[PDB]
Design a protein around this ligand. Structure first.
Ligand SMILES: CC(C)(COP(=O)(O)OP(=O)(O)OC[C@H]1O[C@@H](n2cnc3c(N)ncnc32)[C@H](O)[C@@H]1OP(=O)(O)O)[C@@H](O)C(=O)NCCC(=O)NCCS
Ligand SMILES: CC(C)(COP(=O)(O)OP(=O)(O)OC[C@H]1O[C@@H](n2cnc3c(N)ncnc32)[C@H](O)[C@@H]1OP(=O)(O)O)[C@@H](O)C(=O)NCCC(=O)NCCS
Ligand SMILES: CC(C)(COP(=O)(O)OP(=O)(O)OC[C@H]1O[C@@H](n2cnc3c(N)ncnc32)[C@H](O)[C@@H]1OP(=O)(O)O)[C@@H](O)C(=O)NCCC(=O)NCCS
Ligand SMILES: CC(C)(COP(=O)(O)OP(=O)(O)OC[C@H]1O[C@@H](n2cnc3c(N)ncnc32)[C@H](O)[C@@H]1OP(=O)(O)O)[C@@H](O)C(=O)NCCC(=O)NCCS
Ligand SMILES: CC(C)(COP(=O)(O)OP(=O)(O)OC[C@H]1O[C@@H](n2cnc3c(N)ncnc32)[C@H](O)[C@@H]1OP(=O)(O)O)[C@@H](O)C(=O)NCCC(=O)NCCS
Ligand SMILES: CC(C)(COP(=O)(O)OP(=O)(O)OC[C@H]1O[C@@H](n2cnc3c(N)ncnc32)[C@H](O)[C@@H]1OP(=O)(O)O)[C@@H](O)C(=O)NCCC(=O)NCCS
Ligand SMILES: [Cl-]
Ligand SMILES: [Cl-]
Ligand SMILES: [Cl-]
Lengths: 144, 144, 142
């Protein structure tokens, strides 16, 4: 099903997520480092993918109510992009969110990723908006 | 006949666009003639509208990345304004941009045209700015 | 000379780098707790060697007269050569320059002799935070 990805269940795995997120969002994309980790890590559910014992992909699922999750921090290390890992990650995210009892997902997608997310049957909603100098649009999907 | 909007795919059709642009932006709005035609004509995608065989409306779509276009040079000949032609033009622009594989549009709209563009579900972003003595504001929309 | 007041994002992230290496990786502070909501209001110091960040601390005002000294760290590679002492001298000087009069700190107990050599004094009793023994230490700024 989703064999390369695991639900984070200890601190080491969580810090592996943080490592990827710092490399991608902070170092590569210029998100201020102090903003990368927020007050929602504990309430969120995290996924991690490893390759050869090295953390290479992560996302988090943040419940906003009883039915709906926000998908956040979607990242694949640059070294491992373009080989289907992001797609596998997102498939694992959807499956995990459904397993955890949710029905709907929303995400503030970076605009460069729109075609990728459309291929996963997410749909744009609303209008574009800048956060941290990056263009985004909300995208949504029911979880199946 | 209906007005017909077509993707420019030869030099004569492009010249029809330039004709409208010179009449509207240069002669009517005072844009310096040497600035009307720029170095982005070939990379942009142009639309021409004909009515009774005469060029009456144009715009260009300028890709800025894989997902996003800048809408530029939006003009209807003065003779044909106030009868829905601008609306039809913009609908044809949006459709062409989507057909060409884009997802989002941005535009530096002249402020006098804000209500026109709001009627097409564009939304203002940022703040106003002067170019060529004319007030503008950025406006954006997802393409559907 | 060695230490500069942090005045841009790059310098601040250099502080964060040292703090992660020392407090998180070495001392086991949970990574999500390293950076807090007080980074903006605090004043930070950074020291470099070979063009690389090697020492940091922050000064966090708690009222008009008093600062908390926090995040005092020297990379393991550069310890035992007087850099921590220089850092703390720079912290005191900066805090005084910034208009403060007194400093308090929740010192890790292993550092008590280091801080006593800088004329800090213990107050109160010991307490555990993140599995590490601490004691409050204080000094007037001169
Ligand atoms: C509070 C929080 C939980 C939701 O914030 P929000 O305003 O409702 O949603 P946004 O998606 O627009 O997030 C923008 C905020 O997150 C912060 N942020 C942290 N990491 C970010 C990232 N990778 N990309 C963008 N913004 C990020 C920004 O600094 C901004 O905070 P601010 O409002 O204090 O300026 C936020 O901390 C967060 O996690 N944002 C999501 C960032 C993210 O993961 N983006 C990738 C989506 S796959
Ligand atoms: C978005 C991201 C997670 C995708 O991960 P990935 O491992 O490259 O993804 P995949 O290999 O599974 O490719 C998924 C799709 O992305 C697009 N894509 C990937 N590599 C691409 C490339 N070199 N050129 C163009 N599009 C590309 C394609 O649409 C691709 O689909 P396909 O394989 O069916 O053709 C990754 O690029 C990333 O982490 N980017 C930086 C962080 C970020 O922006 N995250 C999004 C926050 S909302
Ligand atoms: C380089 C270019 C591609 C983008 O420029 P930009 O600075 O990113 O965007 P702006 O929309 O603010 O354009 C202002 C520039 O375009 C030029 N320009 C050409 N035709 C113009 C027009 N109809 N209205 C305003 N500026 C025009 C101005 O002289 C100015 O050039 P400069 O910076 O060398 O002085 C520019 O040549 C262009 O095409 N601008 C868009 C003009 C336009 O079509 N306006 C109507 C939008 S519906
Ligand atoms: C701006 C322009 C393209 C609009 O085209 P148009 O043919 O006049 O507009 P339309 O007749 O299609 O109008 C579409 C709708 O917007 C409304 N609208 C158009 N211009 C408006 C204005 N200035 N104020 C308020 N509403 C306006 C119309 O009333 C119509 O709504 P309706 O169905 O209620 O009647 C045209 O006036 C033009 O070419 N102007 C000169 C060049 C220019 O300024 N271009 C814009 C560069 S960003
Ligand atoms: C909120 C804050 C500003 C003050 O907290 P405080 O309770 O008044 O003071 P303490 O010195 O006892 O700090 C303990 C708290 O800081 C957190 N913390 C962050 N980095 C730490 C570190 N290096 N050492 C110890 N605790 C640390 C702990 O998780 C604990 O948080 P909690 O109460 O939510 O569990 C705190 O975020 C902080 O910065 N603490 C100082 C940590 C530090 O720099 N220690 C070295 C002193 S030289
Ligand atoms: C504590 C720390 C900042 C000191 O920096 P440093 O570069 O090693 O310190 P210096 O070389 O300037 O001086 C070391 C001093 O430690 C003192 N010291 C430490 N343990 C001592 C002990 N058991 N007996 C006597 N002196 C002791 C001495 O006074 C020594 O000074 P000296 O050179 O005059 O003999 C550094 O070891 C560090 O970063 N440790 C890990 C992070 C940490 O625990 N920070 C404190 C949070 S409150
Ligand atoms: Cl995560
Ligand atoms: Cl054109
Ligand atoms: Cl610091």
């Amino acid at each position: 099903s989703n064999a390369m990805f695991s639900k984070v269940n200890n601190q080491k795995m969580l810090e592996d997520c943080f490592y990827i997120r710092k490399k991608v969002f902070v170092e590569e994309q210029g998100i201020p480092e102090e903003s990368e980790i927020d007050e929602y890590e504990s309430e969120s559910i995290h996924l991690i993918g490893y390759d050869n014992g090295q953390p290479v992909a992560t996302a988090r699922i943040r419940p906003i109510n009883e039915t709906t999750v926000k998908i956040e921090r979607v990242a694949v290390m640059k070294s491992h992009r373009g080989q289907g890992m992001g797609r596998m990650l997102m498939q694992a995210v959807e499956s995990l969110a459904k397993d955890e009892g949710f029905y709907v997902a929303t995400m503030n997608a970076q605009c460069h990723a729109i075609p990728f997310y459309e291929s996963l049957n997410f749909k744009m909603r609303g209008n574009i908006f800048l956060e941290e100098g990056i263009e985004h649009i909300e995208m949504t999907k029911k979880l199946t």
